[PDB]
Nucleic acid binder design. Structure first.
Lengths: 45, 380, 330, 610, 171
DNA sequence: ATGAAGTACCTCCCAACTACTTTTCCTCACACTTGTACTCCA
DNA sequence: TGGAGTACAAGTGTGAGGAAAAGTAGTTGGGAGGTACTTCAT
């Protein structure tokens, strides 16, 4: 289950098609994408 | 329309099997009655067929299934289970379809939801049509169980049970082919018959004339005038059972008649259980944050120390025990002023009976005129 | 008995109000020529009068330049039967399109004979029929000094779909008079002024149905009745909870340049602030010139209270409230 | 003098708050909130009786058909005896005639002598205005309005030995102008439908309108409510409709529209308080107590309160209650559709500083609605008030005192005809059940004499064997009439079926007979899961169905027993619908009706989805 | 619902941090017998950070942290379409003091103009400037220069001086 | 009687609020006539 | 006991009156910069 985060009230929030791009608890518009469990790799340098 | 109307009919029967405990044969009886009216829609000229369905008709083919199984439910216990919103009648479209709602036309869904209650005998006339639309006669056994109707109307108003047999001797007088108070069929015209042809209705004016003639021509001086005033005020008295408070809901809905704005004379406790009923009205009935915040400032509960767990054993008593208050009230059992007190009871027994059966004052007044004037035309 | 918060709409009421103001229009223009010699039909009607939008009735001061002589040109019976027959000769031809009870209604109301049936009393909608039941028990138990039961009614009233701003804020004295599990009574008027803050001009041409200005909406040139109730509340609630600078900033941010009651409450904020600090606990550098500002705002906000419209302050006594306050300063 | 006014208007509505404060830092509630504090104020009636005697609309012109006020005739002027209260009401066949002291309750005089003068028109408006308190006297004359004329009477020289009220009259001025007139005031000042006039009252009753007048005719005011009152005795009048209030000085040329109430409200009622400054106005949606200006007595718009009801037939009465520091005003609005009253408490003080307290409401007697409520002045925090009501469509005037601490003819006329031939004819069918119940009080008592008998156990064994052969006759008649695809009696036996009075042992006939059919061709309904429809509770057993009914008619019947036996027997032989066929019958029928409908109704004939 | 926008929201949106400009008119016809007062919405002009009209005005370093700013947020700049811009200060002539400039490009203006001249920069109480140069011609004539719209107008000095007040020629 | 020219004030923008028809419905009354149910005048 | 007018049982033709939910017609609160036009003085 992919989700997002409201930038204002910090509530985790998934979003579907035919939805207003808003938070659903506060009415905030700016709504940043959370990070999920996914493999990236690095040299330890 | 039909795929959803049957589904609202299916959900109304599925309530009665679960909660009012009508048996699992009652589900089958209604399907033939639904299939015989569904075959009726077939036979019409299908272009501008103008099919006749209403929400009054989902009670009828639920009442046509009631007397064929010969159940002691009556139309007083259909006008009550809808007005207290127990089975899906009012707002029958608000929760049921969930997809068919938006792809149905507006006119077909306002009919399909319970916008009004049936009033002034609108419920019987739909039965009289539906008994003519399908042939309920000579395919089913239209014998109305009128004996419990006398028994319930004994228990309605807490009279001695001699009235049960003072009535049934009158019924066995004024009836052609003494038994068989049959449900009336009408398929010929659009005129509602001014006979009061409905056999379930004729029991009332039988019971209204029985309760008068035993008390007016009281030759035995058996029923004293001290008892009459101890019967009227025992009956004209407000109690807080589960069954009378549901009858307070029915007095709310019907606006024309007097004793419809009767809620001013309620008590404290009769209002709390009405508001405790109100938690069964709201369940049938992006800037939603305003109501989300207003319901937070007005929480629906009691704000502290509620009435669920640590309340009592019993405050609210059942239908059997307020009778035992009414019966133990009318202990004295051993004239121009007598008949004035007779009409105290007759008025209070009939105005009680007028809201419980959804008819006008003249709908019952005409039924006195087609019984009393037919009882003496057959006598003399 | 009481007023219901329902937008109730039926063709039979929309017939008899359309039939009435149509007949009103013809006898108006017929009278427009008789006194001279000696397309909704209701949207046209209200273009003549002024809807008050502050009050239910557009009141006037009288001993002023609203004077007018007595029009001693009266009406008599001959002049009235001739000025009504030409409307009714043209009014009878739409009377074949209406329902018979309205043709029964329109004849009787044309000769006096006010109606006796209330418009909410034959609705039989089953949902309005419990709204009429709940509001008549709500105003009854507010009247019957019974606040825990009127709250249960009011919480179950706002949850029915369709209710309006009539019942909403006025008899929200229940939280104000509960005071046990209270939401303070001021969290609700802050809710009312957050979502009903309206600044659209009052258009006055559209027929208003079910929303009415002088107690529940808030347009330009008319502060909302709950807005100035919120300001008188949160100043007494500020005083009784002795925070004064919070309301002294929240009133600062709107310049309502129209009404003066919002300026007097502003003037009264600094007055109560200068009242409280004028004790000084002597029995002293900044506490002298801190009070002298709040004396000065009261003298500049009461002055701009008086340049606006009618809000009669007792300006004489307020100057004596402050002239005693500098004596504590001295 | 508080602060929150508009000048042109001045409010204090339904318990939001006040709109004022002065912030008086004096440790004495530093606020002059327009809503004073005290505890509750309840009103209890003290009921009495004083005396007595298309329909979708109502008439605005008929206002009061009774009156009662302290009056002062010419003899009590000269004499030191002063102060008598009379009652002038209407009566007659169509209500066409015109006609006292309180000992401990208010009642009609001991001599009970009404001076019933009679008129040749229905009586419509009965009122006196009364007089001012700075004139030294009270009025002695009443004015009435009828459909033919306009008459002024005068009470002259009330008596003590005979309680005799002899009157005079003024001459009845008819319709010179042919339009119905509405309201009289004195303080011959009349208001016709549109135009008003001033008259000169004579002092000789043994042998008219003055020559100055005006109108308020608005063409688009379809109601017929007109109204006139002088304002503070300064020859300034206030003329009304349901749309606007006009102030007219007839002494100059001066006329001004003060109120204009077209947009959302309308002016309902207007009663002139005997305080010559403060006068209460009833609009719809608001109660206004609009007083007089200090400088020039024209009209001041003072502290008003939001009226929560909404109706077209509301009136008002107001009564002053003079108290030591202050003056009270209660304001009773009443309606012709119901019985509820609605009040407020205002408190007038010295510097025209006056306030509000709240609201309360009390009921009446349930037959009729108030067409008239009238208070009693009583010659002049334990809030007391008295008044007398008069209900619509009844002509009995009662008496009430509020302190701080039905057989309709419509049900009776349907019966009871005066046929001497058919008098005993109704009693003849009564006489049938005079006997036949005494038969069945002993026909069943015989069965009470046999309790668990071997003669009744033989009879059930005769019963259930008579239920048996008719059963296998009935089912096999259905087996040959099975394939029809186009009914349950258990009353096939006919001898008695009722010579057995043992209700639990009848269940042993009833339970055993059901076990004998384990295979198909018959179905049976229940009697414990289905008998709960009567007692409106959980009824697990049919014996305790009987046992809670037997303990329900203990007091009402002589010995109460065999009735309770054979009601239950009459139920089960009415709830004997036990012969519905089994799984083969309706399922082959429900498929049979599904075929005659096309493919269109097949998918529309489908349960079992959610 | 009316909400309270903070400048961290206006950077994420990449919009301006605008505050609404209101402006009430006076439609006076026939010299004040009839007036009309209309408060007109004139758009939203952008607002300098931590000024009066910012929401970060009277605010603590603890609250600047909670409202998504640095704890020592300095302000003094506008946010215009996401980009933070500021009005550069300038160096102009000191107000209200007649300077005594000589300048070679006054004889490049006309005939017989000297290079001599007095220049004053007069500011109004609403901080609006007005510069008046006072030339010297080689005739002995002295003129008075100003710029009204973008044009440049010259008048003799005794036409001003005898219009300012009632002057005897010896005064 | 034109070749050029600044101003002809056009346009070139949507949405939201709150009202008013608009879409077929379904419900019936509202009441007609000759016989059915009695009493005046031979 | 026979001969005619009105009281009422008993069966039958006309549209009209009444609901709610999609869809719609006016005043408003929400924003972008040149293009296009028909003349008139020399």
């Amino acid at each position: 289950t992919l989700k997002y985060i409201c930038a204002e009230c910090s509530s985790k929030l998934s979003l579907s098609r035919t939805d207003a791009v808003r938070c659903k608890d506060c009415g905030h518009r700016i709504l940043l994408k959370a990070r999920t469990k996914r493999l990236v790799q690095f040299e330890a340098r | 329309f039909l795929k959803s109307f049957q589904f609202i009919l299916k959900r109304q029967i599925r309530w009665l099997i679960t909660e009012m405990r009508f048996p699992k044969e009652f589900e089958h009886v209604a399907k033939i009655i639904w299939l015989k009216i569904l075959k009726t829609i077939n036979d019409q000229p299908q272009e501008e067929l103008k099919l006749q369905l209403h929400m009054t008709s989902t009670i009828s083919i639920l009442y046509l299934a009631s007397t064929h199984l010969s159940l002691p439910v009556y139309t007083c216990d259909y006008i009550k289970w809808i007005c207290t919103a127990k089975m899906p009648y009012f707002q029958a479209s608000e929760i049921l379809p969930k997809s068919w709602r938006i792809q149905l036309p507006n006119y077909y869904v306002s009919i399909l939801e319970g916008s009004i209650s049936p009033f002034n005998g609108q419920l019987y006339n739909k039965i009289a049509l539906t008994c003519g639309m399908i042939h309920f006669k000579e395919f089913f056994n239209s014998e109305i169980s009128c004996q419990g109707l006398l028994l319930k109307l004994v228990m309605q108003c807490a009279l001695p049970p001699e009235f049960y047999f003072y009535t049934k001797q009158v019924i066995e007088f004024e009836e052609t082919d003494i038994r068989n108070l049959t449900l009336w069929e009408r398929t010929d015209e659009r005129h509602t018959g001014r006979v009061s042809n409905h056999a379930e209705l004729r029991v009332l004016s039988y019971f209204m004339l029985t309760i008068n003639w035993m008390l007016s021509f009281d030759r035995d001086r058996q029923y004293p005038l001290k008892w009459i005033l101890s019967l009227t005020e025992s009956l004209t008295q407000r109690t807080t059972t589960s069954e009378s408070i549901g009858r307070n809901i029915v007095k709310v809905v019907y606006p024309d008649k007097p004793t419809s704005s009767d809620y001013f004379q309620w008590s404290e406790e009769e209002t709390l259980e009405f508001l405790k009923w109100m938690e069964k009205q709201f369940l049938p009935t992006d800037q939603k944050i305003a109501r989300r915040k207003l319901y937070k400032i007005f929480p629906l509960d009691r704000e502290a120390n509620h009435d669920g767990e640590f309340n009592d054993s019993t405050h609210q008593l059942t239908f059997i025990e307020d009778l035992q208050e009414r019966y133990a009230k009318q202990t004295p059992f051993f004239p121009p002023a007598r008949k004035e007190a007779i009409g105290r009871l007759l008025t209070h027994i009939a105005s009680q009976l007028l809201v419980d059966f959804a008819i006008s004052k003249e709908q019952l007044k005409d039924c006195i005129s087609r019984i009393k004037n037919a009882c003496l035309h057959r006598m003399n | 008995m009481f007023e219901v918060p329902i937008t109730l709409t039926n063709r039979k009421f929309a017939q008899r109000r359309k039939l009435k103001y149509q007949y009103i229009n013809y006898i108006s223009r017929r009278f427009d020529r008789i006194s001279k010699k000696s397309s909704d039909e209701e949207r046209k009607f209200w273009k003549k009068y002024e809807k008050p939008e502050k009050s239910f009735e557009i009141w006037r001061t009288v001993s002023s330049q609203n004077k007018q002589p007595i029009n001693k040109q009266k009406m008599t019976y001959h002049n009235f039967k001739k000025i009504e027959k030409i409307p009714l000769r043209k009014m009878e031809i739409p009377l074949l399109h209406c329902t018979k009870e309205n043709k029964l209604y329109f004849q009787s109301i044309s000769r006096g004979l006010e109606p006796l049936k209330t418009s909410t009393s034959e609705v039989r909608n089953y949902r309005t029929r419990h709204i009429v039941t709940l509001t008549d028990l709500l105003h009854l138990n507010v009247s019957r000094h019974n606040w825990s039961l009127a709250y249960k009614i009011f919480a179950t009233l706002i949850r029915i779909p369709g209710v309006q701003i009539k019942s909403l804020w006025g008899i929200g004295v229940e939280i104000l008079d509960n005071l046990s599990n209270s939401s303070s009574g001021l969290d609700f008027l802050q809710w009312m002024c957050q979502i009903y803050s309206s600044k659209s001009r009052f258009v006055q041409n559209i027929n208003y149905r079910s929303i009415v200005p002088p107690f529940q909406t808030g347009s330009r040139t008319h502060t909302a009745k709950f807005a100035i109730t919120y300001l008188w509340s949160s100043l007494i609630n500020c005083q009784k909870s002795m925070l004064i600078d919070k309301i002294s900033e929240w009133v600062l941010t709107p310049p309502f340049m129209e009404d003066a009651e919002v300026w007097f409450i502003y003037a009264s904020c600094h007055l109560l602030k200068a009242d409280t600090l004028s004790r000084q606990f002597v029995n002293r550098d900044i506490k002298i010139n801190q009070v002298i500002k709040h004396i000065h705002y009261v003298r500049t906000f009461l002055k701009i209270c008086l340049d606006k419209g009618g809000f009669a302050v007792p300006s004489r006594l307020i100057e004596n409230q402050l002239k005693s306050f500098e004596s504590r300063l001295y | 003098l508080g602060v929150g006014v508009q000048g042109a208007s001045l409010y204090c509505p339904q318990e939001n708050y006040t709109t004022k404060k002065q912030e008086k830092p004096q440790w004495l509630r530093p606020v002059d909130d327009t809503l004073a504090e005290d505890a509750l104020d309840l009103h209890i009636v003290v009921k009495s009786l004083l005396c007595d005697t298309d329909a979708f609309f109502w008439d605005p012109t008929v206002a009061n058909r009774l009156d009662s006020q302290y009056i002062q005739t010419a003899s009590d002027l000269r004499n030191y005896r002063d102060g008598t209260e009379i009652i002038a009401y209407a009566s007659g066949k169509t209500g066409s005639v015109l006609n006292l002291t309180r000992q401990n309750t208010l009642h009609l005089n001991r001599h009970n002598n009404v001076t019933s003068i009679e008129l040749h028109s229905p009586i419509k408006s009965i009122k006196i205005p009364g007089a001012s308190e700075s004139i030294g006297r009270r009025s002695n004359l009443v004015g009435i309005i009828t459909e033919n004329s306009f008459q002024i009477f005068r009470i002259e020289s009330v008596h003590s030995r005979s309680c005799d009220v002899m009157v005079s009259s003024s001459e009845p001025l008819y319709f010179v102008e042919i339009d119905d007139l509405q309201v009289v005031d004195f303080a011959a000042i009349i208001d016709i439908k549109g135009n008003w006039s001033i008259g000169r009252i004579p002092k000789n009753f043994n042998n008219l309108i003055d020559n100055l007048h005006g109108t308020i005719f608005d063409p688009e005011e379809l109601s017929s409510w007109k109204r006139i009152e002088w304002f503070s005795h300064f020859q300034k009048i206030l003329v009304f409709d349901r749309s606007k209030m006009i102030e007219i000085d007839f002494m100059n040329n001066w006329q001004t529209e003060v109120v204009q109430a077209k947009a959302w409200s309308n002016i309902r009622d207007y009663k002139r308080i005997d305080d010559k400054n403060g006068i209460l106005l009833t609009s719809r949606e608001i109660i206004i107590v609009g007083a007089s200006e200090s400088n020039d007595p024209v009209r001041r718009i003072s502290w008003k309160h939001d009226l929560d009801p909404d109706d077209t037939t509301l009136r008002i009465t107001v009564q002053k209650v003079k108290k030591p520091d202050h003056i009270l005003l209660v304001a009773f609005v009443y309606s012709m559709r119901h019985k509820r009253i609605y009040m407020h408490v205002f408190s007038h003080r010295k510097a025209n500083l006056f306030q509000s307290l709240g609201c309360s409401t009390v009921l009446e007697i349930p037959g009729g609605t108030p067409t008239g409520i009238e208070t009693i002045l009583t010659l002049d925090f334990e809030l007391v008030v008295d008044f007398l009501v008069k209900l619509r469509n009844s002509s009995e005037v009662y008496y009430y005192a509020l302190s701080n601490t039905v057989d309709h003819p419509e049900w009776a006329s349907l019966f009871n005809n005066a046929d001497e031939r058919e008098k005993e004819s109704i009693g003849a069918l009564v006489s049938q059940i005079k006997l036949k119940e005494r038969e069945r009080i002993s026909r069943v008592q015989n069965l009470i004499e046999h309790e668990n008998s071997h003669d009744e156990d033989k009879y059930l064994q005769d019963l259930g064997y008579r239920l048996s052969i008719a059963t296998n006759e009935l089912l096999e008649s259905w087996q040959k009439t099975k394939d029809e695809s186009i009914h349950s009696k258990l009353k096939n036996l006919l001898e008695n079926s009722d010579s057995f009075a043992s209700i639990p042992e009848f269940s042993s006939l009833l339970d055993q007979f059901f076990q004998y059919y384990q295979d198909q061709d018959v179905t049976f309904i229940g009697f414990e899961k289905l008998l709960h429809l009567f007692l409106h509770e959980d009824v697990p057993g049919l014996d305790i169905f009987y046992n809670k009914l037997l303990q329900c008619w203990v007091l009402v019947s002589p010995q109460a027993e065999l009735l309770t036996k054979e009601i239950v027997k009459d139920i089960i032989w009415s709830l004997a619908r036990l012969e519905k066929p089994s799984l083969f019958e309706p399922i082959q029928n429900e498929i049979s009706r599904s075929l005659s409908g096309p493919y269109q109704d097949i998918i529309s004939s489908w349960d079992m989805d959610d | 619902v009316e909400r309270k926008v903070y400048p961290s929201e206006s950077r994420q949106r990449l919009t301006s941090y605008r505050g609404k400009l209101l402006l009430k008119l006076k439609w006076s016809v026939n010299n004040g017998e009839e007036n009309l007062f209309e408060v007109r919405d004139c758009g939203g002009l952008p607002v300098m950070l931590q000024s009066n009209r910012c929401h970060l005005n009277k605010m603590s370093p603890y609250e600047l942290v909670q409202h998504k700013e640095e704890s020592d947020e300095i302000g003094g700049y506008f946010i215009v379409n996401g980009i933070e811009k500021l009005i550069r200060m300038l160096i102009v002539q000191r107000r209200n003091h007649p300077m005594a400039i000589i300048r070679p490009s006054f004889a490049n203006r006309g005939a017989s103009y000297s290079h001599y001249g007095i220049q004053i920069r007069s500011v109004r109480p609403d901080q609006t400037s007005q510069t008046n140069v006072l030339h010297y011609l080689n005739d002995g004539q002295v003129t008075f220069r100003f710029s009204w719209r973008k044009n440049e107008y010259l008048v003799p000095v005794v036409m001003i001086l005898k219009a300012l007040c009632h002057t005897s020629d010896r005064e």
